[PDB]
Structures are given as structure tokens and as C-alpha cells.
Design a protein around this ligand. Sequence first.
Ligand SMILES: *[C@@H]1O[C@H](CO)[C@@H](O[C@@H]2O[C@H](CO)[C@@H](O[C@@H]3O[C@H](CO)[C@@H](O)[C@H](O[C@H]4O[C@H](CO)[C@@H](O)[C@H](O)[C@@H]4O)[C@@H]3O)[C@H](O)[C@H]2NC(C)=O)[C@H](O)[C@H]1NC(C)=O
Lengths: 173, 55
Amino acid sequence: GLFGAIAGFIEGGWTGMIDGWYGYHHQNEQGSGYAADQKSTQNAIDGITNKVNSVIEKMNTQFTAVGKEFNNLERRIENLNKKVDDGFLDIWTYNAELLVLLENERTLDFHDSNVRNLYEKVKSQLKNNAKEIGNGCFEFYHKCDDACMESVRNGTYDYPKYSEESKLNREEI
Amino acid sequence: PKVRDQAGRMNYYWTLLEPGDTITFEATGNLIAPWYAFALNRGSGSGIITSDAPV
Ligand SMILES: *[C@@H]1O[C@H](CO)[C@@H](O[C@@H]2O[C@H](CO)[C@@H](O[C@@H]3O[C@H](CO)[C@@H](O)[C@H](O[C@H]4O[C@H](CO)[C@@H](O)[C@H](O)[C@@H]4O)[C@@H]3O)[C@H](O)[C@H]2NC(C)=O)[C@H](O)[C@H]1NC(C)=O
């Protein structure tokens, strides 16, 4: 992971999560579960969709191309013609393969990067109210519930509304 | 040399006579006259291929 998240500080995938590519895990006393992130996932969806389509548009589909015949006094021009056929075939084969190599790296990067963005966007919301407990996990300095879990995934978690509670909790360390 | 048992040879020829044009043959021997000819309809992106796959 060029962005250190995937196959990095967040070691694993969640075969549990099946909603989408990026998501949170939560365990409030009320219970556990998975909830994939709409905004990010839909973005990644949209983008990567655009990426495949953009690459494919650059490929005009091939029209009728049948080979040419030549008689035995036309060896030079039959060879010229093979040179062209082989020359273009090398170029398209090289372009196709090289593109797919390079762009596969970019795509995986993209996903790694989106994940890091997510994490850090949460981290900048919580701060004191929770601590970095490793592998993309926060631990709440205060008690929180399922409806509250939806404030996080909302991008609207109210840091003041629990800053009091978390303060006197954190300060017992 | 004899090919298909023939020490004689025959060259085949073709030509596209354009709408309006006239083609005249004159001979004192050796002409293998046209008997049937073909009026052409141009398409595009057709072609000739070599295949042993079944239709
Ligand atoms: C339609 O196409 C077929 C070809 O698929 C063609 O029939 C083939 O023609 C050749 C020539 O007639 C045949 O091969 C010959 O076989 C005879 C008899 O057994 C041999 O004597 C021949 O050898 C002599 O002549 C040769 C030169 O022409 C010399 O090379 C040789 O040294 C001998 O002097 C010759 O090999 C063949 O048998 C058939 N093939 C089949 C599958 O029948 C047919 O003629 C074509 N029809 C038309 C209208 O074009």
C-alpha cells in the first residue's frame, strides 16, 4: 500500500461487510455489525466506472481488415505489407498490456487512498473523545449508542456534546 | 511443358467497363470471347477469407 492503509496499518479485509468497498465496524453494548460508507463507496464506484469507460472509448472498434494477396514478383511489397501489419500489431499489443499494468497500480492506489481519507476524516472528528487503538480503530472515551454510531458515519458527530464526558474519563488514565 | 496435358497456354484477362463505355474486340484468331459478363454492385467492408470452418 503506497498509502500505507491497505495491507498496511489496516491489515485485513472484512468478508463480513458486503454493503460496499469502504465501511466501518462497530460494537456498542447494544450489539455489533458492519455499515459501508455511501459517499466514499459511491464515489469510488463512479470514478472507477468512468475509468474503465474512458479507457475503452479510446479504442475505436476494429473494422473489416482482410489481408492482401501478392504474386511472386511482388515479394518486396508483400514484405512491406507484412511489416506494416506486424508493426501495428506490436504497437497495439504493447499499448494494451502496458496500460493495463500501469493502470492497475493506479487503481489499487486509489482504493488505498480513499480508505486513508476516510480514517483521517473520522480521526479529525473525534480527537480527544477517543484514542488510536490500532488497525484503523478508535476507542470511545465516552459511551455511545447505535443512533450515535450513525452520527459518525454521518460526518456530523458532535464533538462538544461528548467532550465534557470524555474529558473526565480520559483524565483518569 | 505439358500442364494438365496441354503444351498450349491461355491467358485470362479482365477489365471494368464503365457505365457508358463501349468495349470492342477485334481478332483474326486466338480470342477466347466473353460469353457471360457481370454487372457489379459495390458494397463495402466485405472481403475474402480463407477458412475451413462450416457455414
Ligand atoms: C478440379 O480440381 C481437381 C483437383 O482437386 C482436379 O482433379 C485433380 O487433377 C489432377 C490433374 O488431373 C489429378 O492428378 C493427376 O492424376 C493422374 C491420374 O492418376 C496422373 O496421371 C497425373 O500425373 C501426370 O500429369 C501430371 C501433370 O499434370 C504430372 O505431374 C505427372 O508426372 C503425370 O504426367 C496427375 O497427377 C488428380 O488426380 C485430381 N485430383 C483429384 C482429387 O481427383 C480436377 O481436374 C479439377 N477440375 C477442373 C475442371 O479444373
